[PDB]
Amino acid sequence: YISRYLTDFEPIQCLGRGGFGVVFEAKNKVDDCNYAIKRIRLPNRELAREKVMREVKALAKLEHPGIVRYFNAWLEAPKVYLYIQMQLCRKENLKDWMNGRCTIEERERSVCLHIFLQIAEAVEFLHSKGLMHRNLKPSNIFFTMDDVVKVGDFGLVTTKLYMSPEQIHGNSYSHKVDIFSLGLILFELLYPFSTQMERVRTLTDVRNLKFPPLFTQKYPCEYVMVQDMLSPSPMERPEAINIIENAVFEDLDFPGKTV
Numbered sequence: 463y464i465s466r467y468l469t470d471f472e473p474i475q476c477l478g479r480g481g482f483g484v485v486f487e488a489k490n491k492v493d494d495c496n497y498a499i500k501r502i503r504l505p506n507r508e509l510a511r512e513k514v515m516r517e518v519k520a521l522a523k524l525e526h527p528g529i530v531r532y533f534n535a536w537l538e539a540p541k542v543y544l545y546i547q548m549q550l551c552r553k554e555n556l557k558d559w560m561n562g563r564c565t566i567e568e569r570e571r572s573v574c575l576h577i578f579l580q581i582a583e584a585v586e587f588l589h590s591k592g593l594m595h596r597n598l599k600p601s602n603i604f605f606t607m608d609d610v611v612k613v614g615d616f617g618l619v620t621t622k623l624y625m626s627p628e629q630i631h632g633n634s635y636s637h638k639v640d641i642f643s644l645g646l647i648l649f650e651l652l653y654p655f656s657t658q659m660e661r662v663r664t665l666t667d668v669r670n671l672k673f674p675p676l677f678t679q680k681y682p683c684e685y686v687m688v689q690d691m692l693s694p695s696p697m698e699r700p701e702a703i704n705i706i707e708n709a710v711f712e713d714l715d716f717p718g719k720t721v
């Protein structure tokens with residue numbers, strides 16, 4: 463049996479694993495580029511298989527600067543494996559980026575807003591296509607080699623903190639679930655943590671609209687935005703288009719910014 467993956471790619475390293483999958487960095491032999499390749503073992507459940515096959519077809523249609531870039535998808539039956547070849551991001555994701563910036567000086571307003579705008583625009587792209595993310599969190603947000611923000615479903619398991627209340631309670635939901643996730647991410651970008659204990663305590667309070675007093679005073683506009691985004695009632699949350707048009711996102715600049 464000839465394995466498509468082993469014939470066409472030189473394996474470099476394992477990047478991690480999560481859910482049905484394992485992810486590898488591998489060099490394509492013919493084109494000489496390095497790719498991220500997710501190998502998903504298809505489950506012994508027809509409805510879960512149905513979903514997986516739908517999801518791969520749906521991602522193959524997607525093209526946006528803030529969405530992870532697709533190359534190929536294929537099946538191998540040596541257990542059936544689905545391989546998905548995407549553009550290789552940097553190893554450190556948004557979660558790691560925030561854990562390496564634990565002071566207020568390292569979270570300058572315009573830098574965080576620039577990053578948040580990229581995420582929000584990726585989300586708005588999905589919503590405009592009648593899609594949603596459902597699982598938006600910092601560990602699902604990576605960077606390209608040139609620091610362009612990339613949203614995907616990375617599935618590297620090393621959390622329900624960013625999940626809307628309607629999902630946590632297992633109720634039906636709408637694209638508005640992603641707006642709830644964005645609210646928490648915006649807060650987290652602007653508010654650096656020293657310990658994981660502090661992070662969990664504070665983010666839990668923020669979910670319930672309890673804010674650190676020094677955050678409300680420093681960032682009054684962003685405070686209002688986060689409140690609205692974190693409404694318990696999904697209807698009350700603003701559309702992604704209304705967030706990206708907010709005044710705080712105009713003329714964003716910082717020393718070192720591209721172009």
Ligand SMILES: Cc1ccc2cc(-c3c(C)ccc(C(=O)c4c(-c5ccccc5)n(C)n(-c5ccccc5)c4=O)c3N)ccc2n1
Nearest residue numbers: 477498499500514517521546548549551552553614615616
């Ligand atoms: C450094 C590094 C580490 C891991 C990486 C993983 C990926 C990656 C790979 C290799 C494959 C797929 C994705 C991805 O984002 C996925 C996406 C996805 C989600 C939103 C936007 C774009 C893609 N989907 C839907 N699915 C999916 C496929 C089948 C079943 C369920 C989910 C995904 O796996 C994905 N993020 C890409 C680059 C990586 N770079």
